[PDB]
Amino acid sequence: FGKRKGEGFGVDKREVEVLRRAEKLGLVTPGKTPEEQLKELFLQGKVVLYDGRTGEPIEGPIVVGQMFIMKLYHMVEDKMHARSTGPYSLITQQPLG
């Protein structure tokens, strides 16, 4: 944020509408500079998020962070399968498996 209020931009109009809501929730202390409140949301690990489909903000402040997430071994590529008709079994003549 400090990068911001120096690079020539202030608080944003949607960040207030969200801050309005955060106050009804109780995430922020009412009657404090937006920076004070955004600070307060941050420390709760929450940030303002704009839906990219509209530009409008998420009515709430969201948890956004950095996670360690592995790709497991179980991939669709190894498990999609289908047969119309195929092999059958010697004694039963039912399809193989």
Binding site: F9, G10, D12, K13, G55
Partner: protein, 226 residues
Amino acid sequence: SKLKAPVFTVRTQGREYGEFVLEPLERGFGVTLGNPLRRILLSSIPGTAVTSVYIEDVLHEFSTIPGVKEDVVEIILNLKELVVRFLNPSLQTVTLLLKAEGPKEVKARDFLPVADVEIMNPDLHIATLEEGGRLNMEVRVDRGVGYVPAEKHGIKDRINAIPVDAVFSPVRRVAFQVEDTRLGQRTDLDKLTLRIWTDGSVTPLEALNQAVEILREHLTYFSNPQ
């Protein structure tokens, strides 16, 4: 009474950045304008990136070249970063060229020069070579739009030409502020500022015009109803 045409400001820095203000606009046109533009600015804006590679004495991606510390998977990957600006407009496709040897950390400038093509990041690392290690590429970069992945375009000049993935789009990032403003009389007007970041092929400004142009072009489709 209605507001009138507002004051366009333009604050370009380098060939990369840009800040584009519009003042003043009717309350709730901050987004009504700044979102759909940012949507088209991320998705539809032509540009360049590499498409395919031959490497002398190589036949598939998963190879390895002696006296170069990088595997071909990491070279085809260091070559996606490379960003190529075309100068001639009617130029659709190039074929760069490279060769080096000895203990040289081949960076992206080491490519041979062509006219109507500038290597917008010369300092790019490419491949580390030690005494005895050769190299000879034939990259094939293209103007296109959006994201077109290897498994999808199959671009082979030679027979052992590794197709590569294209980050065509030249827009690195697009944010946009909406802050409060007034035309003396009225409150709660909107001050749209439009950030734009770029690689160099096209520039924040040219991007933003191009975005608008498509946006305009699209509204025409509403002309002929059934």
